[PDB]
Structures are given as C-alpha cells and as structure tokens.
Amino acid sequence: KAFEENVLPFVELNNRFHLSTPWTFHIWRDYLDNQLNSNENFSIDELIEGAEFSDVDLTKISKDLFTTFWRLSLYDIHFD
Amino acid sequence: KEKIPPPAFDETFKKFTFIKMGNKLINNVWKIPTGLDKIEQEVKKPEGVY
C-alpha cells in the first residue's frame, strides 16, 4: 500500500503532467502484474483504468496489441 | 563624601532579526517555493512543443 500512496496514479501522470509512455509504464508494471496474479476479478479493474495517450496516435493502431506490448516483461516471454 | 546612587541592572533581553536562520546564504535556499504546482506550469504541453 505504501507504493500506492507515494507514487502518483497512472491516470494523471499522463494528463496533468506529461511523462512519456516508456517512462510511465516502467514505474507501473510490477504493480499491474502483481494485481493481475492476485485476483481475476481485478482483471477488469485496471484495463478499464486508462488515460489519454497524447504522445502516440490511437487512430489506426490496435489497442489489443498496443496495451499488450507495453504490459508484458521478459519474465513471461522467454523460458530456460 | 560622594553620594552613591543605587545601581541600575538591565532586565531586558536582546531581540531577534528578520532573517529566520543564521546566514543570508542558508536563508536564501529556504525561500525557493517548492510544490507540485511549480512543475505543472513549466512542462505544460509536449504537443505544443512538438
């Protein structure tokens, strides 16, 4: 919970200020994979929670892959 | 044959200054306005910059 109260939320790190999408997801990727492995009813919570992407154009990109590419790490793609 | 007067002891304390710290150098660092509203008006819009 201490991570939640100190670091600002993902919605207004892209709206009030203007951070970049490589830098915005780098802070908020461990938290969005711990909550997705905690409960499956929380799976509908975070993916609805999304802000306006003023850096890149969402007009003919598929958000089924643009969100999917920025969410995964190397932990669940490679195995040895 | 000298009339000794009663002595006068000072019962007053010294007063402080308007500099709220020691130096004028250390005090200048503690006058910078800090907050989240100051970064807000500097980075304002990237698409306006782009």
Q: How was this entry determined?
A: cryo-EM
Find out whether A52 and A15 touch, Cβ atoms under 8 Å.
yes
- CB neighbours of B1 closer than 8 A, spacing ≥ 6? none
The residue among A66, A64, A48 whose CA lies nearest residue A56 is A66
Q: Is B46 on the interface with A (CB under 8 A)?
A: yes
Q: Is B39 on the interface with A (CB under 8 A)?
A: yes
Q: Do A17 and B40 touch (CB under 8 A)?
A: yes
Measured CA to CA, the distance from residue A20 to residue A12 in angstroms comes to 12
- What resolution (Å)? 3.2
Measured CA to CA, the distance from residue A69 to residue A32 in angstroms comes to 14
Exposed, middle or buried, B41 (CB in 10 Å: 0-12/13-18/19+)?
Answer: exposed
Measured CA to CA, the distance from residue B46 to residue A21 in angstroms comes to 13
Q: Give the CA-trace dihedral at A65, A1, B34, A53, to 10 degrees.
A: 10
Measured CA to CA, the distance from residue B24 to residue B19 in angstroms comes to 7
Tokens representing residue A17 in the block: 């200020």
Q: Do A54 and B47 touch (CB under 8 A)?
A: yes
Q: How far is CA B31 from CA B25, B35, B48, in A?
A: 11, 12, 31
